[PDB]
Swiss-Prot record:
It comes from Homo sapiens (Human). Helicase component of the SKI complex, a multiprotein complex that assists the RNA-degrading exosome during the mRNA decay and quality-control pathways. The SKI complex catalyzes mRNA extraction from 80S ribosomal complexes in the 3'-5' direction and channels mRNA to the cytosolic exosome for degradation. SKI-mediated extraction of mRNA from stalled ribosomes allow binding of the Pelota-HBS1L complex and subsequent ribosome disassembly by ABCE1 for ribosome recycling. In the nucleus, the SKI complex associates with transcriptionally active genes in a manner dependent on PAF1 complex (PAF1C). It is linked to Trichohepatoenteric syndrome 2: A syndrome characterized by intrauterine growth retardation, severe diarrhea in infancy requiring total parenteral nutrition, facial dysmorphism, immunodeficiency, and hair abnormalities, mostly trichorrhexis nodosa. Hepatic involvement contributes to the poor prognosis of affected patients. It is found in: Nucleus; Cytoplasm. This is Superkiller complex protein 2. Belongs to the helicase family. SKI2 subfamily.
Length: 99
């Protein structure tokens, strides 16, 4: 179950969120799915809320929507959604990679 595709993690607790500055190597895959969510507003909401005194503000609709979208996406794919394939979506031509 762990060596076939990427086991889509389903959080065992409540579906919270963080916004982290990730490196390319810490990110497993670039999924093909396109969720046209507004990053600017999500940043202008997360960074605002992460004041310890204002950590308990009511969630913003864009942030809640993104969190819900990610959680269902984890639920919505049996073994992991396709990544933006180097060959079949990014149009590359290395033969060794096909092998």
């Amino acid at each position: 179950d762990d060596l076939v595709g990427f086991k889509l993690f389903l959080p065992e607790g409540p579906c919270d969120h963080t916004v982290v500055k990730l490196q390319p190597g810490d990110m497993a895959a670039i999924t093909t799915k396109v969720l046209r969510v507004n990053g600017e507003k999500i940043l202008e909401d997360f960074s605002k809320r992460q004041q310890p005194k204002f950590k308990k503000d009511p969630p913003l609709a864009a942030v809640t929507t993104a969190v819900q979208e990610l959680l269902r996406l984890a639920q919505a794919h049996p073994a992991g959604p396709p990544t933006l394939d180097p060959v079949n979506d990014l149009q590359l031509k290395d033969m060794s990679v096909v092998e």
